Symmetry: D2
């Protein structure tokens, strides 16, 4: 392995071209993105055989400074005329490989830095502000893109995936976990009604990479829509395990978005421990945080 690059390249752009013209699904009211405020955290990695002597000899002649990569990303966010993080990464990657012919490969990660609408009273009524935004530390969209310069000096995308990270959902009832192996290592009781609390990271892969860029936005798959499918399916399903739930979310994703090839789940179990099971004259219960160990599930659903 031989790579180097820059991480935590934060870049905030105001008034990016809005995303509109998206194709709706029943689970989601998502209709586009205003892009008054557009934030991204970019990681860039680059490689190529011509970088060998920067390691073996300390010769920096062909080294693009990682600081310069940061400048490159921030300048290109200013000049970017598209509407998606996915398209931004393609713009950076193509531009970078064109600038630096001795670089053979570039890998990019982009994480949305999300902001939420706020409201203000002016001129007699309360309405969504065009100026004030709330920074959100909850779920955020992601994008991945790698590009290579082939031996004949043409450029090709070699990896492209989009995702949703940091989704934390708890369903207070309508979940069971029963029937698992009960042997000398088992102390978990069967539970026919648990408050299942899952963390979800979901990544999808398009059949056609162009669909991820937003150039024809009807073919784009928005993280907001994926989020709304996850919450709807969770609600609809009498879950039998996290494994069972994520398969059903993946099936719904692929049914709603036939232009997707596959979807990959990383889930974690953070379900609370029960403290009080019965409250006089009430349907309520009391729970608390568990010990640190957490379950996880990794599963790919394919079209």
């Amino acid at each position: 392995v031989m790579y180097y690059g820059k991480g935590d390249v934060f870049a905030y752009r105001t008034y990016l071209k809005p995303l509109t013209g998206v194709r709706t699904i029943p689970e989601s009211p998502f209709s586009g993105r205003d892009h008054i405020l557009f934030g991204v955290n970019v990681k860039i990695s680059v490689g190529g055989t011509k970088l060998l002597t920067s390691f073996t000899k300390g010769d920096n002649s062909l080294v693009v400074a990682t600081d310069s990569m940061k400048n490159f990303i921030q300048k290109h966010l200013a000049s970017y005329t598209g509407t998606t993080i996915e398209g931004f990464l393609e713009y950076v990657a193509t531009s970078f490989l064109k600038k630096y012919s001795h670089i053979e490969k570039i890998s990019l990660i982009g994480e949305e830095i999300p902001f939420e609408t706020t409201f203000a009273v002016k001129n007699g009524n309360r309405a969504a502000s065009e100026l004030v935004f709330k920074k959100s530390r909850n779920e955020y969209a992601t994008a991945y893109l790698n590009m290579v310069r082939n031996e004949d000096n043409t450029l090709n995308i070699t990896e492209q995936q989009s995702g949703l990270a940091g989704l934390q959902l708890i369903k207070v009832s309508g979940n069971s976990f029963v029937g698992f192996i009960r042997d000398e290592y088992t102390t978990l009781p069967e539970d026919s009604n648990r408050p299942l609390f899952v963390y979800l990271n979901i990544k999808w892969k398009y059949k056609n990479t162009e669909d991820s860029f937003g150039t024809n936005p009807e073919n784009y798959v928005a993280a907001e829509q994926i989020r709304d499918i996850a919450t709807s399916v969770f609600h609809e399903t009498e879950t039998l395990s996290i494994q069972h739930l994520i398969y059903l979310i993946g099936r719904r994703i692929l049914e709603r978005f036939p232009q997707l090839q596959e979807v990959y789940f990383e889930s974690q179990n953070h379900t609370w421990d029960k403290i009080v099971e019965e409250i006089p004259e009430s349907e309520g219960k009391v729970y608390t945080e568990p010990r640190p160990p957490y379950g996880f599930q990794c599963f790919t659903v394919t079209q």
Copy 2:
């Protein structure tokens, strides 16, 4: 000083009595809390001269185990019949001092663990779910309550305050910071139009402690309403500094809630550094994260 207790006592209750009958303000559509899911993180501290020998002699005869304090809090969340974190703390404090007559003082902090509504498609339409909630890592309500046993064995509340923590608001334009001292220590440029990014922690103190408990809910001041005042005032104001902004927020809070005695602000400046000031054929700009040092301001507004 001589205190001991328990921190990070997480407790989650389902179907707490709903909060309704609140009094509305123009800045906020807040109308109550469903309380299907109610989460709190409690810190408890206790003191009293009769605890001295637990330190000086290792005599535990009068020590309530901190583990037992955790049990006490969790069991009392199950039996609490009220509607606010503030009222829950009063319930815990009164019950604890009544149980342990050798304790002279108890101090409680309660932090909301907030959850957000999600939506699902069922029976033909998309609607808010009564089952699935999204855990939020953004702003959260807080409550503080201390109680003492007086020499005559009566009980009195000695401190009570409510608050809103973790509010992070950025206003993309309509903010200046000019006219400050420019001397041999100054390298900050004057800025007539900055994207002010503030973190806000807001704490309010009622004239009458009973108004914080929700027993007469029309007198309650909800953190949600405070949040909406902050975003509205930020939007409305051509800010001249963070100092200027928080004074105006405080004035609006005290105008909207005449039952409050005072409001206290802790603010932090996290405004981004500018990278690209002019983008062709666009009003947008590009910013990035600053170095770690952050400004802060602390100010009390009184009725």
Copy 3:
């Protein structure tokens, strides 16, 4: 309340004047600091009645920018000719009040950024490096100073406190917790031999604030020495509780350092849960992390 300032002012100085001539104690090998690398994280808070209109009117005429306070601190670390964080805070505070006559109060917190020695080999010989240091995320020294301008324009230190933060100590045996109250809320079993794991924050005040500066190093109390007292007392003591332990550490500190007036403890209990109590042909056991709730103790010992 009315203050503002700057937090997370990191400043790293190479080749500060070495701290020499400190009085050693039997518990610690500490004899000074080479100060090849000296790191501090400073927080500065300033107040004064003349700051009022910066809040109430948006008037910035008397506003020292918080950015300028950062410059002030970093420049004064370059010009500081002393040998301790405590003395550095005094230098900054005096300098700041002499510079800005409208400031009536300044509060400073200084936290050591600790580095540990590393070893290197030169012509076969292994010895401590004078060039390479390891950044430590473990315990660190602290200092606090509050200075006021009196009506007659003299400057007075009204509060001074030094400390050690982030010390995490586990004693595998020789600890008990028995004899505490057992009632309807008590599930904690009595334990005659637990692996007590405590977090310690230890703060001390001098009888004479001048002794904190290091000008007469024989009177200076080093956080390193406090660390080694704490571990030695923990080792020696068959502890009966954390309360019992911290009182005994405090007594030993005050015996070793008669120039101190008080020692204040903030401790937390993070003792592991036992999983396997008996291992064949072994004295060992297996433990794991507990649930999040943690006990804490707060206690002052006075000279």
Copy 4:
């Protein structure tokens, strides 16, 4: 992809069999580990075609609960008679596959939870304590193991890797970064003498997997020795870049440990910004923390 498992399985063992007889090297006096306290954080991932219906149908018949995997790991730490994390992982993997015939693949990560010796006094004689240890949040050893069940039912280790994570080293002088590309994106000044601050994660692979277990300690490569090579090479080298440094560290490791096949580096650049470059009558300078973006390098050196 189809796996599931358990993360953050903390397990602490007292009086593990000591590691002794480790061959020393010039750069390190390390010869073994007393193992009075042995802490590990384990992540376990398992797979197998027979797990399919646990996802596709919600059938839990062949689901080992992740909670039971936690119990399995903690119980096996109690019964483990070896001396290394690498060997512990082999013990867990082999035992798990022997127990659960439907599992075809197991992947394990083990991270040391490191503790440091402390001082205690006995009759004025200061010595290392056999009871009190300091929990360290600095660098720590790692181990990785993947084991598969073949069609002929033999068990085979397909990947094994050891490592050191979290090493943070700063060298105050004797580092340059010059001669890199200067074009339209370059603003970084050349620096002939910078205080290079690197984060290092170092991983190695053995020619023979059996050498990683420690059964013959003379063939075992300890993370502590790798740590000491890294600090020594950093000191000795007039570095020309991080790339240059990590190649030289890798070469030294492979020279000292001919039983290793490769060393893999993940480094990060966290070098401070210079604030004051000249201090009168002093060689010192003042630096501060940079903006968030960080450089990184990834590189494999082979035997």
